[PDB]
Amino acid sequence: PNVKFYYFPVKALGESQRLLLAYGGQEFEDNRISSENWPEFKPKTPFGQMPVLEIDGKQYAQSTAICRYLGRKYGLAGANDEEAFEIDQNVEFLNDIRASAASVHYEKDEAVKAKKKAELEETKYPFFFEKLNEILTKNNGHIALGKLTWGDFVYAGMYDYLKAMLQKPDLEQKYPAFRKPIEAVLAIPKVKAYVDAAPRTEL
Amino acid sequence: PNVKFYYFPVKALGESQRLLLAYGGQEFEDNRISSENWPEFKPKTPFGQMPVLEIDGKQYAQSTAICRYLGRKYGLAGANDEEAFEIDQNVEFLNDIRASAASVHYEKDEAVKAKKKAELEETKYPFFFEKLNEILTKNNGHIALGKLTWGDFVYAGMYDYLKAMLQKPDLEQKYPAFRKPIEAVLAIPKVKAYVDAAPRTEL
Numbered sequence: 001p002n003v004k005f006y007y008f009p010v011k012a013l014g015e016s017q018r019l020l021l022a023y024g025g026q027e028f029e030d031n032r033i034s035s036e037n038w039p040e041f042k043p044k045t046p047f048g049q050m051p052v053l054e055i056d057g058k059q060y061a062q063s064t065a066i067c068r069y070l071g072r073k074y075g076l077a078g079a080n081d082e083e084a085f086e087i088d089q090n091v092e093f094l095n096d097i098r099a100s101a102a103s104v105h106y107e108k109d110e111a112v113k114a115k116k117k118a119e120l121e122e123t124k125y126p127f128f129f130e131k132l133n134e135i136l137t138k139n140n141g142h143i144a145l146g147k148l149t150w151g152d153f154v155y156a157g158m159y160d161y162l163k164a165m166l167q168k169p170d171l172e173q174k175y176p177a178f179r180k181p182i183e184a185v186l187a188i189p190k191v192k193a194y195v196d197a198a199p200r201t202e203l
Numbered sequence: 204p205n206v207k208f209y210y211f212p213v214k215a216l217g218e219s220q221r222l223l224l225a226y227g228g229q230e231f232e233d234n235r236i237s238s239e240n241w242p243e244f245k246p247k248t249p250f251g252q253m254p255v256l257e258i259d260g261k262q263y264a265q266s267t268a269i270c271r272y273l274g275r276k277y278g279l280a281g282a283n284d285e286e287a288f289e290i291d292q293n294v295e296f297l298n299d300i301r302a303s304a305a306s307v308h309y310e311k312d313e314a315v316k317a318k319k320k321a322e323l324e325e326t327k328y329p330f331f332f333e334k335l336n337e338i339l340t341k342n343n344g345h346i347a348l349g350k351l352t353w354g355d356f357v358y359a360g361m362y363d364y365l366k367a368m369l370q371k372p373d374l375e376q377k378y379p380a381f382r383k384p385i386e387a388v389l390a391i392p393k394v395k396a397y398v399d400a401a402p403r404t405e406l
């Protein structure tokens with residue numbers, strides 16, 4: 001199909017779709033829209049945001065919903081309702097970690113940012129990280145089902161952005177499992193080939 | 204099946220599952236766990252939080268993932284991948300509105316809460332509400348597909364909690380469409396019967 005993907009020139013919420021498209025052997029226009037040019041595209045999007053995936057002229061918005069749809073098309077969404085559920089479940093936990101980190105990162109008052117961070121360090125982060133370590137260990141380096149699923153692509157796509165927001169670049173020294181879903185996705189030749197060819201960004 | 208649902212004695216994130224179970228004609232133990240007793244249940248949950256749905260001893264956590272699963276079991280998740288996608292997409296937009304309201308509501312510093320609110324009033328809320336009004340209008344009073352789906356139950360379950368966080372109890376005076384998904388769910392006899400029999404809470 002004619003496929004076009006629209007997102008900013010970063011990984012953040014959109015890289016997981018690019019990686020999923022690479023997995024599926026689906027060639028696509030990687031439309032990396034600069035901040036300066038974005039406003040001319042914004043009213044053409046379903047909700048006024050990116051990412052947007054366009055397939056034969058039909059637009060799909062909302063990052064996780066797009067990854068789930070691509071995961072289903074590429075056989076990465078489990079074999080029945082209960083398996084599909086587990087992936088949704090573990091990805092929704094990942095989104096809580098992202099949301100908690102985002103609440104610190106996007107605080108523009110450096111003083112309030114500082115107290116929010118301290119508070120999360122003692123009350124949510126330790127529990128999130130131990131829980132993520134349990135899940136990655138239970139699933140042998142994967143986010144769900146003990147094998148490759150679309151949830152590994154969501155994890156791989158957002159991992160650096162998460163780390164940048166957590167302000168622990170050194171996260172995976174205490175938790176070497178945290179690298180494993182990325183390794184699983186980058187082990188896939190097509191995906192490795194796309195990543196080797198693609199720009200790098202810090203988030 | 205033997206079904207048990209565990210959540211706090213409020214609607215917030217868990218009411219949508221109770222309503223979906225009522226729709227499905229699935230009798231269940233509505234286990235409303237008080238804050239004071241919660242800690243004894245917390246280590247028995249998959250992630251250390253509620254809601255948790257237990258079916259024949261197997262636990263399902265993560266609210267949206269549970270609603271999607273129940274929606275699929277009850278034929279409320281569309282008829283193909285593209286329809287299922289649209290529901291996921293529009294519910295993920297709803298979650299952004301919730302997340303934005305939550306960032307104000309859970310601010311414990313009343314001064315900072317005040318500036319965050321003012322900032323959202325001029326920069327995200329007007330766009331969210333117009334966009335939600337468009338979606339509800341396009342879909343004839345529903346969150347997606349122009350008909351009843353599991354996304355209407357998510358909306359119905361969280362609507363009061365959202366309003367309490369937005370600090371616009373008067374939301375649906377400017378936007379009478381905002382009441383419609385609730386009307387669609389409450390029009391269903393089993394669901395109306397459960398709601399008539401169930402406790403009321405302000406969120």
Ligand SMILES: N[C@@H](CCC(=O)N[C@@H](CS)C(=O)NCC(=O)O)C(=O)O
Nearest residue numbers: 013048049050051062063064295299
């Ligand atoms: N829930 C949406 C969130 C999308 C979102 O926040 N997009 C941001 C970038 S990561 C954006 O388009 N900002 C531009 C704007 O709002 O004008 C999704 O996951 O796709």
Ligand SMILES: N[C@@H](CCC(=O)N[C@@H](CS)C(=O)NCC(=O)O)C(=O)O
Nearest residue numbers: 092096216251252253254265266267
């Ligand atoms: N992403 C989870 C969030 C669950 C959540 O935040 N649960 C809260 C109540 S709404 C909770 O269990 N708080 C108790 C605690 O953390 O000890 C979901 O949607 O189910």
